[PDB]
Tab-separated table of all heavy atoms in Angstrom:
chain	number	residue	atom	x	y	z
F	250	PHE	N	284.504	206.842	78.287
F	250	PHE	CA	284.609	205.445	78.708
F	250	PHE	C	285.980	204.898	78.320
F	250	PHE	O	286.599	204.141	79.078
F	250	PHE	CB	283.481	204.599	78.098
F	250	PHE	CG	282.120	204.867	78.694
F	250	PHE	CD1	280.991	204.282	78.164
F	250	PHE	CD2	281.977	205.672	79.807
F	250	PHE	CE1	279.748	204.513	78.714
F	250	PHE	CE2	280.728	205.896	80.362
F	250	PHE	CZ	279.622	205.328	79.815
F	251	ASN	N	286.474	205.305	77.154
F	251	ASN	CA	287.824	204.906	76.741
F	251	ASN	C	288.882	205.371	77.729
F	251	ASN	O	289.932	204.747	77.882
F	251	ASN	CB	288.154	205.415	75.343
F	251	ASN	CG	287.693	204.476	74.259
F	251	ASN	OD1	288.502	203.776	73.641
F	251	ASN	ND2	286.387	204.446	74.017
F	252	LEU	N	288.600	206.469	78.412
F	252	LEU	CA	289.527	206.980	79.404
F	252	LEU	C	289.488	206.114	80.661
F	252	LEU	O	290.531	205.812	81.254
F	252	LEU	CB	289.182	208.429	79.742
F	252	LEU	CG	290.009	209.578	79.150
F	252	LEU	CD1	290.747	209.188	77.882
F	252	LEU	CD2	289.103	210.785	78.915
F	253	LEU	N	288.284	205.719	81.070
F	253	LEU	CA	288.137	204.830	82.218
F	253	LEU	C	288.689	203.434	81.916
F	253	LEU	O	289.264	202.783	82.775
F	253	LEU	CB	286.669	204.731	82.638
F	253	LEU	CG	286.006	206.060	82.964
F	253	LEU	CD1	284.560	205.866	83.412
F	253	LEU	CD2	286.814	206.804	84.021
F	254	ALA	N	288.503	202.979	80.687
F	254	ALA	CA	288.976	201.663	80.290
F	254	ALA	C	290.471	201.538	80.517
F	254	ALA	O	290.946	200.505	80.987
F	254	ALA	CB	288.645	201.406	78.857
F	255	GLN	N	291.206	202.602	80.208
F	255	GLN	CA	292.662	202.595	80.350
F	255	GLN	C	293.122	202.104	81.716
F	255	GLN	O	294.123	201.418	81.822
F	255	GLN	CB	293.255	203.979	80.065
F	255	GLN	CG	293.112	204.423	78.617
F	255	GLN	CD	293.669	205.813	78.385
F	255	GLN	OE1	294.578	206.253	79.092
F	255	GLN	NE2	293.119	206.520	77.397
F	256	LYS	N	292.378	202.441	82.758
F	256	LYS	CA	292.733	202.018	84.098
F	256	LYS	C	292.719	200.500	84.220
F	256	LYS	O	293.420	199.924	85.051
F	256	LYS	CB	291.770	202.635	85.100
F	256	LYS	CG	292.073	202.304	86.542
F	256	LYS	CD	291.200	203.147	87.451
F	256	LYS	CE	291.767	203.221	88.855
F	256	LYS	NZ	291.631	204.601	89.392
F	257	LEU	N	291.921	199.851	83.384
F	257	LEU	CA	291.805	198.401	83.427
F	257	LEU	C	292.666	197.755	82.344
F	257	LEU	O	292.802	196.534	82.299
F	257	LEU	CB	290.341	197.979	83.242
F	257	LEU	CG	289.340	198.566	84.244
F	257	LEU	CD1	287.893	198.385	83.779
F	257	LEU	CD2	289.557	197.990	85.646
F	258	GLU	N	293.236	198.587	81.472
F	258	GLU	CA	293.950	198.122	80.288
F	258	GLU	C	293.056	197.180	79.496
F	258	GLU	O	293.508	196.139	79.017
F	258	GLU	CB	295.254	197.409	80.674
F	258	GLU	CG	296.251	198.252	81.487
F	258	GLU	CD	297.591	197.541	81.684
F	258	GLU	OE1	298.445	197.635	80.770
F	258	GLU	OE2	297.783	196.873	82.735
F	259	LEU	N	291.786	197.549	79.371
F	259	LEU	CA	290.775	196.699	78.739
F	259	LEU	C	291.177	196.080	77.409
F	259	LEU	O	290.800	194.948	77.126
F	259	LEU	CB	289.478	197.478	78.530
F	259	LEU	CG	288.341	197.218	79.512
F	259	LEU	CD1	287.077	197.934	79.038
F	259	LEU	CD2	288.115	195.728	79.609
F	260	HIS	N	291.932	196.823	76.599
F	260	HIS	CA	292.241	196.404	75.233
F	260	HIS	C	293.045	195.099	75.173
F	260	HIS	O	292.933	194.348	74.210
F	260	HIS	CB	292.984	197.509	74.476
F	260	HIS	CG	294.383	197.716	74.962
F	260	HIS	ND1	294.711	198.669	75.901
F	260	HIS	CD2	295.533	197.065	74.668
F	260	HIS	CE1	296.005	198.604	76.156
F	260	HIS	NE2	296.527	197.638	75.422
F	261	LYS	N	293.848	194.811	76.190
F	261	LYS	CA	294.645	193.589	76.132
F	261	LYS	C	293.907	192.343	76.619
F	261	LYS	O	294.518	191.304	76.868
F	261	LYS	CB	296.003	193.757	76.830
F	261	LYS	CG	295.970	193.972	78.328
F	261	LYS	CD	297.358	194.382	78.832
F	261	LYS	CE	297.420	194.531	80.359
F	261	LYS	NZ	297.407	193.238	81.116
F	262	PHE	N	292.585	192.449	76.722
F	262	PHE	CA	291.743	191.353	77.193
F	262	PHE	C	290.620	191.079	76.200
F	262	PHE	O	289.923	190.073	76.294
F	262	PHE	CB	291.145	191.680	78.561
F	262	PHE	CG	292.156	191.813	79.646
F	262	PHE	CD1	292.494	193.058	80.146
F	262	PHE	CD2	292.777	190.689	80.175
F	262	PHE	CE1	293.448	193.187	81.167
F	262	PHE	CE2	293.722	190.809	81.186
F	262	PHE	CZ	294.062	192.063	81.683
F	263	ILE	N	290.451	191.978	75.241
F	263	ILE	CA	289.354	191.873	74.296
F	263	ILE	C	289.664	190.828	73.245
F	263	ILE	O	290.769	190.797	72.708
F	263	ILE	CB	289.058	193.237	73.651
F	263	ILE	CG1	288.345	194.115	74.683
F	263	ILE	CG2	288.213	193.084	72.391
F	263	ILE	CD1	288.345	195.587	74.369
F	264	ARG	N	288.696	189.959	72.972
F	264	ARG	CA	288.889	188.913	71.980
F	264	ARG	C	288.212	189.343	70.708
F	264	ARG	O	286.979	189.391	70.634
F	264	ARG	CB	288.339	187.566	72.472
F	264	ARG	CG	288.823	187.198	73.874
F	264	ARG	CD	288.516	185.744	74.262
F	264	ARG	NE	287.099	185.387	74.151
F	264	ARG	CZ	286.612	184.176	74.421
F	264	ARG	NH1	287.432	183.208	74.827
F	264	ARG	NH2	285.308	183.927	74.285
F	265	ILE	N	289.024	189.676	69.711
F	265	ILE	CA	288.501	190.139	68.429
F	265	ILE	C	289.318	189.586	67.249
F	265	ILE	O	290.554	189.500	67.317
F	265	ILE	CB	288.426	191.677	68.388
F	265	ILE	CG1	287.632	192.150	67.171
F	265	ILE	CG2	289.803	192.263	68.404
F	265	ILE	CD1	287.510	193.652	67.065
F	266	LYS	N	288.624	189.213	66.171
F	266	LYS	CA	289.239	188.469	65.061
F	266	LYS	C	289.832	189.316	63.927
F	266	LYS	O	291.034	189.611	63.932
F	266	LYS	CB	288.255	187.439	64.493
F	266	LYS	CG	288.892	186.087	64.188
F	266	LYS	CD	287.967	184.930	64.562
F	266	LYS	CE	288.535	184.089	65.719
F	266	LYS	NZ	287.762	182.815	65.937
F	267	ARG	N	288.999	189.687	62.953
F	267	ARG	CA	289.476	190.441	61.784
F	267	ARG	C	289.245	191.962	61.896
F	267	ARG	O	288.471	192.544	61.124
F	267	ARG	CB	288.834	189.915	60.481
F	267	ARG	CG	289.103	188.440	60.136
F	267	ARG	CD	287.997	187.522	60.663
F	267	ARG	NE	286.917	187.285	59.702
F	267	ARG	CZ	285.734	186.772	60.036
F	267	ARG	NH1	285.485	186.464	61.303
F	267	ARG	NH2	284.796	186.571	59.114
F	268	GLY	N	289.920	192.610	62.843
F	268	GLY	CA	289.718	194.032	63.048
F	268	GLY	C	290.481	194.619	64.217
F	268	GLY	O	290.799	193.928	65.193
F	269	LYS	N	290.778	195.907	64.115
F	269	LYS	CA	291.470	196.602	65.190
F	269	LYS	C	290.510	196.795	66.347
F	269	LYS	O	289.288	196.728	66.172
F	269	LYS	CB	292.028	197.959	64.725
F	269	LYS	CG	293.046	197.847	63.600
F	269	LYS	CD	294.127	198.919	63.678
F	269	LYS	CE	295.197	198.685	62.608
F	269	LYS	NZ	296.453	199.434	62.891
F	270	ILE	N	291.076	197.024	67.524
F	270	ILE	CA	290.298	197.290	68.716
F	270	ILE	C	290.146	198.799	68.901
F	270	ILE	O	290.765	199.402	69.786
F	270	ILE	CB	290.974	196.687	69.952
F	270	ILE	CG1	291.269	195.205	69.717
F	270	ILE	CG2	290.099	196.852	71.178
F	270	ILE	CD1	291.873	194.488	70.921
F	271	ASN	N	289.315	199.409	68.064
F	271	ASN	CA	289.121	200.854	68.099
F	271	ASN	C	288.337	201.334	69.336
F	271	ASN	O	288.040	200.554	70.242
F	271	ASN	CB	288.476	201.332	66.790
F	271	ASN	CG	287.123	200.713	66.553
F	271	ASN	OD1	286.470	200.257	67.490
F	271	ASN	ND2	286.684	200.697	65.298
F	272	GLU	N	287.995	202.615	69.367
F	272	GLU	CA	287.386	203.198	70.557
F	272	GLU	C	285.948	202.719	70.733
F	272	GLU	O	285.494	202.578	71.851
F	272	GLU	CB	287.485	204.725	70.519
F	272	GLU	CG	288.850	205.206	70.043
F	272	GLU	CD	289.407	206.373	70.858
F	272	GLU	OE1	288.601	207.128	71.461
F	272	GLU	OE2	290.654	206.528	70.893
F	273	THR	N	285.246	202.454	69.634
F	273	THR	CA	283.916	201.862	69.707
F	273	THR	C	283.910	200.472	70.396
F	273	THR	O	283.105	200.216	71.287
F	273	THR	CB	283.236	201.784	68.308
F	273	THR	OG1	282.574	203.022	68.026
F	273	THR	CG2	282.183	200.686	68.272
F	274	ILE	N	284.810	199.580	69.994
F	274	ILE	CA	284.894	198.277	70.637
F	274	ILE	C	285.184	198.416	72.132
F	274	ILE	O	284.511	197.803	72.964
F	274	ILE	CB	285.949	197.358	69.984
F	274	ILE	CG1	285.719	197.217	68.476
F	274	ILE	CG2	285.960	196.003	70.640
F	274	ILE	CD1	284.365	196.688	68.114
F	275	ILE	N	286.171	199.231	72.478
F	275	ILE	CA	286.550	199.408	73.877
F	275	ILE	C	285.425	200.005	74.714
F	275	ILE	O	285.198	199.599	75.857
F	275	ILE	CB	287.776	200.307	74.001
F	275	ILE	CG1	288.963	199.675	73.281
F	275	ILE	CG2	288.119	200.560	75.467
F	275	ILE	CD1	290.194	200.536	73.325
F	276	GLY	N	284.708	200.961	74.138
F	276	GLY	CA	283.620	201.608	74.846
F	276	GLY	C	282.453	200.666	75.019
F	276	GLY	O	281.773	200.687	76.047
F	277	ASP	N	282.222	199.853	73.992
F	277	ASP	CA	281.259	198.763	74.043
F	277	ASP	C	281.606	197.795	75.192
F	277	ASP	O	280.761	197.481	76.029
F	277	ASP	CB	281.266	197.989	72.711
F	277	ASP	CG	280.545	198.720	71.582
F	277	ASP	OD1	279.951	199.798	71.840
F	277	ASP	OD2	280.557	198.196	70.429
F	278	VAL	N	282.855	197.329	75.227
F	278	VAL	CA	283.282	196.349	76.218
F	278	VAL	C	283.262	196.944	77.616
F	278	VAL	O	283.018	196.244	78.592
F	278	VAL	CB	284.673	195.730	75.873
F	278	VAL	CG1	285.231	194.886	77.010
F	278	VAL	CG2	284.564	194.890	74.622
F	279	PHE	N	283.494	198.240	77.723
F	279	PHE	CA	283.435	198.864	79.033
F	279	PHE	C	282.026	198.714	79.632
F	279	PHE	O	281.884	198.220	80.736
F	279	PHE	CB	283.879	200.314	78.964
F	279	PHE	CG	283.979	200.967	80.297
F	279	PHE	CD1	285.111	200.806	81.075
F	279	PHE	CD2	282.949	201.747	80.778
F	279	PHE	CE1	285.212	201.422	82.306
F	279	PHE	CE2	283.048	202.359	82.004
F	279	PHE	CZ	284.177	202.193	82.768
F	280	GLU	N	280.999	199.110	78.879
F	280	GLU	CA	279.594	198.845	79.230
F	280	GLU	C	279.278	197.352	79.544
F	280	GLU	O	278.675	197.045	80.566
F	280	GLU	CB	278.650	199.371	78.111
F	280	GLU	CG	278.555	200.893	78.036
F	280	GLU	CD	277.733	201.418	76.871
F	280	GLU	OE1	277.568	200.699	75.858
F	280	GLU	OE2	277.252	202.572	76.961
F	281	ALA	N	279.675	196.438	78.660
F	281	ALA	CA	279.368	195.013	78.818
F	281	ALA	C	279.947	194.436	80.108
F	281	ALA	O	279.270	193.736	80.845
F	281	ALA	CB	279.882	194.241	77.627
F	282	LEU	N	281.206	194.751	80.370
F	282	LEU	CA	281.921	194.328	81.570
F	282	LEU	C	281.169	194.707	82.845
F	282	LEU	O	281.057	193.909	83.774
F	282	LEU	CB	283.293	194.991	81.539
F	282	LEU	CG	284.421	194.680	82.503
F	282	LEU	CD1	284.422	195.696	83.610
F	282	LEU	CD2	284.281	193.258	83.033
F	283	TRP	N	280.638	195.923	82.890
F	283	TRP	CA	279.884	196.339	84.055
F	283	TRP	C	278.560	195.605	84.175
F	283	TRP	O	278.171	195.221	85.268
F	283	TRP	CB	279.758	197.870	84.121
F	283	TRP	CG	281.086	198.437	84.539
F	283	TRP	CD1	282.031	199.015	83.736
F	283	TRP	CD2	281.661	198.367	85.841
F	283	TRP	NE1	283.142	199.345	84.470
F	283	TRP	CE2	282.941	198.955	85.766
F	283	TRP	CE3	281.210	197.880	87.071
F	283	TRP	CZ2	283.768	199.075	86.871
F	283	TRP	CZ3	282.037	198.004	88.172
F	283	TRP	CH2	283.298	198.595	88.062
F	284	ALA	N	277.882	195.388	83.051
F	284	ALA	CA	276.706	194.536	83.050
F	284	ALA	C	277.076	193.132	83.536
F	284	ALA	O	276.305	192.498	84.257
F	284	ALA	CB	276.099	194.462	81.681
F	285	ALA	N	278.257	192.650	83.156
F	285	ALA	CA	278.666	191.315	83.578
F	285	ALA	C	278.918	191.238	85.088
F	285	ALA	O	278.441	190.307	85.734
F	285	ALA	CB	279.868	190.833	82.795
F	286	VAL	N	279.644	192.204	85.655
F	286	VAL	CA	279.793	192.259	87.115
F	286	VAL	C	278.415	192.255	87.790
F	286	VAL	O	278.142	191.493	88.723
F	286	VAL	CB	280.578	193.516	87.574
F	286	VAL	CG1	280.395	193.751	89.079
F	286	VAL	CG2	282.065	193.408	87.197
F	287	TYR	N	277.535	193.094	87.272
F	287	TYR	CA	276.185	193.214	87.787
F	287	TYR	C	275.457	191.873	87.810
F	287	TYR	O	274.951	191.453	88.851
F	287	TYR	CB	275.421	194.220	86.943
F	287	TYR	CG	273.974	194.380	87.308
F	287	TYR	CD1	273.599	194.726	88.598
F	287	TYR	CD2	272.984	194.226	86.362
F	287	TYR	CE1	272.271	194.899	88.941
F	287	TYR	CE2	271.661	194.387	86.692
F	287	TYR	CZ	271.311	194.732	87.983
F	287	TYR	OH	269.993	194.908	88.321
F	288	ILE	N	275.400	191.208	86.660
F	288	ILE	CA	274.781	189.890	86.577
F	288	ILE	C	275.467	188.874	87.503
F	288	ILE	O	274.812	188.246	88.339
F	288	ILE	CB	274.790	189.344	85.154
F	288	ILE	CG1	274.008	190.277	84.222
F	288	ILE	CG2	274.201	187.968	85.139
F	288	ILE	CD1	272.562	190.453	84.589
F	289	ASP	N	276.783	188.742	87.366
F	289	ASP	CA	277.572	187.831	88.187
F	289	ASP	C	277.439	188.064	89.686
F	289	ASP	O	277.703	187.158	90.472
F	289	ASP	CB	279.047	187.912	87.803
F	289	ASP	CG	279.855	186.764	88.361
F	289	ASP	OD1	279.766	185.646	87.800
F	289	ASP	OD2	280.577	186.976	89.359
F	290	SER	N	277.059	189.275	90.086
F	290	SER	CA	276.867	189.580	91.504
F	290	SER	C	275.449	189.215	91.948
F	290	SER	O	275.054	189.462	93.088
F	290	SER	CB	277.089	191.057	91.756
F	290	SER	OG	275.986	191.795	91.255
F	291	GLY	N	274.674	188.634	91.043
F	291	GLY	CA	273.300	188.322	91.370
F	291	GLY	C	272.374	189.508	91.187
F	291	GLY	O	271.329	189.596	91.825
F	292	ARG	N	272.764	190.414	90.295
F	292	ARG	CA	271.990	191.615	89.994
F	292	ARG	C	271.898	192.539	91.203
F	292	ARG	O	270.872	193.186	91.449
F	292	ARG	CB	270.627	191.270	89.381
F	292	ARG	CG	270.764	190.671	87.975
F	292	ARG	CD	269.431	190.359	87.301
F	292	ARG	NE	268.535	191.505	87.312
F	292	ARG	CZ	267.494	191.630	88.128
F	292	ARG	NH1	267.189	190.653	88.977
F	292	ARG	NH2	266.745	192.724	88.078
F	293	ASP	N	273.010	192.601	91.933
F	293	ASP	CA	273.147	193.475	93.088
F	293	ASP	C	273.648	194.829	92.605
F	293	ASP	O	274.839	194.994	92.327
F	293	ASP	CB	274.123	192.859	94.098
F	293	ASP	CG	274.245	193.677	95.384
F	293	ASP	OD1	273.828	194.866	95.413
F	293	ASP	OD2	274.791	193.133	96.377
F	294	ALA	N	272.737	195.796	92.512
F	294	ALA	CA	273.069	197.110	91.957
F	294	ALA	C	273.846	197.980	92.950
F	294	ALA	O	274.708	198.773	92.559
F	294	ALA	CB	271.824	197.822	91.487
F	295	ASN	N	273.535	197.830	94.234
F	295	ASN	CA	274.243	198.573	95.257
F	295	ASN	C	275.705	198.158	95.238
F	295	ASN	O	276.601	199.003	95.188
F	295	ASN	CB	273.593	198.368	96.637
F	295	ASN	CG	272.127	198.830	96.672
F	295	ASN	OD1	271.712	199.706	95.901
F	295	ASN	ND2	271.343	198.242	97.561
F	296	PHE	N	275.946	196.852	95.217
F	296	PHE	CA	277.311	196.341	95.200
F	296	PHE	C	278.088	196.767	93.951
F	296	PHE	O	279.255	197.134	94.035
F	296	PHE	CB	277.321	194.815	95.289
F	296	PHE	CG	278.651	194.210	94.955
F	296	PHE	CD1	279.631	194.091	95.929
F	296	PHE	CD2	278.936	193.795	93.659
F	296	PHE	CE1	280.868	193.562	95.617
F	296	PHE	CE2	280.176	193.260	93.341
F	296	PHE	CZ	281.142	193.143	94.320
F	297	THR	N	277.450	196.682	92.789
F	297	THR	CA	278.122	197.000	91.543
F	297	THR	C	278.470	198.485	91.486
F	297	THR	O	279.573	198.867	91.077
F	297	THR	CB	277.265	196.594	90.351
F	297	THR	OG1	276.909	195.215	90.493
F	297	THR	CG2	278.022	196.784	89.032
F	298	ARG	N	277.541	199.311	91.941
F	298	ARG	CA	277.743	200.748	91.969
F	298	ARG	C	278.911	201.152	92.878
F	298	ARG	O	279.721	202.017	92.528
F	298	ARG	CB	276.450	201.479	92.356
F	298	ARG	CG	276.700	202.891	92.808
F	298	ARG	CD	275.471	203.750	92.860
F	298	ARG	NE	274.408	203.328	93.773
F	298	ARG	CZ	274.528	203.094	95.080
F	298	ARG	NH1	275.701	203.167	95.705
F	298	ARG	NH2	273.446	202.749	95.765
F	299	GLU	N	279.025	200.516	94.031
F	299	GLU	CA	280.173	200.800	94.884
F	299	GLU	C	281.499	200.358	94.261
F	299	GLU	O	282.539	200.985	94.498
F	299	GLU	CB	279.990	200.203	96.282
F	299	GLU	CG	278.760	200.753	97.009
F	299	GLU	CD	278.864	202.247	97.371
F	299	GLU	OE1	279.370	202.551	98.479
F	299	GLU	OE2	278.425	203.110	96.568
F	300	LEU	N	281.473	199.296	93.458
F	300	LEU	CA	282.707	198.808	92.842
F	300	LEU	C	283.141	199.810	91.784
F	300	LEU	O	284.299	200.197	91.726
F	300	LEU	CB	282.514	197.414	92.227
F	300	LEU	CG	283.597	196.319	92.318
F	300	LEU	CD1	283.696	195.583	90.992
F	300	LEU	CD2	284.983	196.802	92.772
F	301	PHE	N	282.197	200.228	90.950
F	301	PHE	CA	282.437	201.286	89.971
F	301	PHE	C	283.066	202.528	90.622
F	301	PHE	O	284.091	203.042	90.159
F	301	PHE	CB	281.126	201.674	89.293
F	301	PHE	CG	281.304	202.567	88.116
F	301	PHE	CD1	281.621	202.037	86.872
F	301	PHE	CD2	281.158	203.935	88.242
F	301	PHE	CE1	281.780	202.860	85.770
F	301	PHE	CE2	281.325	204.773	87.150
F	301	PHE	CZ	281.631	204.237	85.916
F	302	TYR	N	282.446	202.986	91.703
F	302	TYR	CA	282.936	204.140	92.457
F	302	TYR	C	284.352	203.947	93.014
F	302	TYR	O	285.180	204.851	92.963
F	302	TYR	CB	281.960	204.488	93.580
F	302	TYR	CG	280.662	205.078	93.073
F	302	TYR	CD1	279.604	205.302	93.932
F	302	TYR	CD2	280.507	205.432	91.745
F	302	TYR	CE1	278.424	205.853	93.489
F	302	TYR	CE2	279.324	205.988	91.286
F	302	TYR	CZ	278.279	206.194	92.167
F	302	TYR	OH	277.081	206.738	91.735
F	303	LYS	N	284.629	202.763	93.528
F	303	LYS	CA	285.931	202.484	94.076
F	303	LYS	C	286.969	202.721	92.995
F	303	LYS	O	287.990	203.365	93.222
F	303	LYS	CB	285.984	201.042	94.583
F	303	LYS	CG	287.347	200.603	95.080
F	303	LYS	CD	287.237	199.597	96.219
F	303	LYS	CE	288.596	199.405	96.905
F	303	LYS	NZ	288.500	198.678	98.213
Side-chain angles (χ1 to χ4, degrees):
Chain F
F250 288 174
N251 273 254
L252 258 22
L253 303 182
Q255 293 178 28
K256 182 171 200 139
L257 303 166
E258 302 187 84
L259 258 188
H260 71 265
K261 66 191 184 74
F262 295 106
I263 286 163
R264 310 192 305 179
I265 191 180
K266 222 141 246 190
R267 300 93 92 195
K269 299 213 175 197
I270 307 183
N271 61 22
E272 317 223 335
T273 274
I274 306 302
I275 299 178
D277 284 355
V278 170
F279 186 83
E280 289 175 337
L282 188 263
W283 286 101
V286 165
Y287 176 56
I288 300 299
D289 194 77
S290 74
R292 292 182 52 256
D293 184 344
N295 300 334
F296 166 85
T297 306
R298 162 165 61 55
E299 300 293 271
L300 219 221
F301 190 83
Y302 289 172
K303 175 148 192 167

